[PDB]
From a paper:
NHLRC2 (NHL repeat containing protein 2) is an essential cytosolic protein of unknown function, mutation of which was recently identified in association with FINCA (fibrosis, neurodegeneration, cerebral angiomatosis) disease, a multi-organ condition which is fatal in early childhood. NHLRC2 contains three domains; an N-terminal thioredoxin-like (Trx-like) domain, followed by a six-bladed NHL repeat containing β-propeller domain and then a C-terminal β-stranded domain. The N-terminal Trx-like domain contains a CCINC motif at the position of the CXXC motif, which is characteristic of oxidoreductases and commonly involved in thiol-disulfide exchange. The six-bladed β-propeller domain comprises six NHL repeats, a structural motif originally identified in genes NCL-1, HT2A and LIN-41 and shown to often function as a protein-protein interaction module.
The crystal structure of the β-propeller domain was solved by single-wavelength anomalous dispersion method using selenomethionine substituted protein. The crystals of native β-propeller domain diffracted to 1.75 Å, belong to a space group P21 and contain one molecule of the β-propeller in the asymmetric unit. Given the high resolution of the data, the electron density for the main-chain is complete and side chain residues are clearly visible, except for a short fragment between residues 346 and 352 where the electron density is missing. The β-propeller domain of NHLRC2 comprises six blades containing four twisted antiparallel β-strands, labeled A–D from the inside to the outside of the molecule, arrayed around a central pseudo-sixfold axis. In contrast to other β-propeller proteins, the NHLRC2 β-propeller is not closed by a so called ‘Velcro strap’ which is the insertion of the first N-terminal β-strand into the last propeller blade framework. Instead, N- and C-terminal β-strands even though located in close proximity to each other, belong to separate β-propeller blades. The central pore of the β-propeller domain of NHLRC2 is approximately 12 Å in diameter and contains a number of water molecules. The continuous water channel is disrupted by hydrogen bonds which Lys-228 and Asp-340 form with water and backbone groups of adjacent blades. No electron density corresponding to metal ions were observed in the NHLRC2 β-propeller structure and structure-based alignment does not reveal any relevant residues which might participate in a catalytic reaction. Together this suggests that the domain does not function as an enzyme, but rather that the NHLRC2 β-propeller domain is involved in protein-protein interaction(s).
Residue numbers in the entry: 219 to 346, 352 to 572
Amino acid sequence: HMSPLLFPGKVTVDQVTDRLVIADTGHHRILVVWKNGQIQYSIGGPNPGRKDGIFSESTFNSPQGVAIMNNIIYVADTENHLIRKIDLEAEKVSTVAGIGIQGTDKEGGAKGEQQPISSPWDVVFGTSRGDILWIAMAGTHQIWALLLDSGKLPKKNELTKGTCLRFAGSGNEENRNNAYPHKAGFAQPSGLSLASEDPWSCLFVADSESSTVRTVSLKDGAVKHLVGGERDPMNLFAFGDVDGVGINAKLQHPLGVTWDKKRNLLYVADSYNHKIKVVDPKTKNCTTLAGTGDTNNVTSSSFTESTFNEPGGLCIGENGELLYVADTNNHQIKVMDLETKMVSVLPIF
């Protein structure tokens, strides 16, 4: 109980300042820290709530996904079933989607606080300038979008700012890929990462209950298998810990993905296996990058001898030099140096 963090589920990196944003999930607060670990903002706490307003009165409820661009942070405020907006310039928290209770709507289409949502778990910025917030909607097994400005989703017509709706996923809890996004099926999708550039042009999805990684095309929304699971779209009992190509790889409840555009590699928080995996989206090869699989925590080690404990999220740093891991059940951000192949613990001060 001595770490300043408690079960931190997610971490992201600000691309223009190199700051980190940490969802300190168990303390119901969001941290903004400089890359050396010095805290700049602590927003929320100590108890769960859904209060908006100035920073000192704002509260969250077991938040997960965090995304930052241009001094605005969006929060998958999971247990409130809300998307929240932290405006660092104005030092105000606001609510931009959800009604504060768990929705069952598998389609969406309403604006903002008129639209019920269900256990949002991860968020990333996209571009139809950062005018889309993509949402891993774990509660209804779907990928959703919030329009931050008016714009068009892939193959759709323009929708007004604030529209919040399903993009991919039927709503059935399945491991189902499809040429048409509404006919695909996900199973507790919990991690997203954007690869907007050719030849990828996709969102990568950590599909936790199917133990797979999928791609969702930003050209036409086609949902495709990348690694893990089995062919049967109803089989959610297809987990394990196996390095291999495509369908031969086995994951266990992966909660996070992050795209490394420098190396054209995808890193995966393979949470229940206590490992970080690396996927080459070309060869579809999934191999172990770091983690022995045991949960005896060591604070300094090589990649191969490092340990994690259900890491809930991760994010590549600027220019792909460092990989930050929300090492959830160790209450730490682990810093993986991709040049020295060493793992350390981010100090928080």
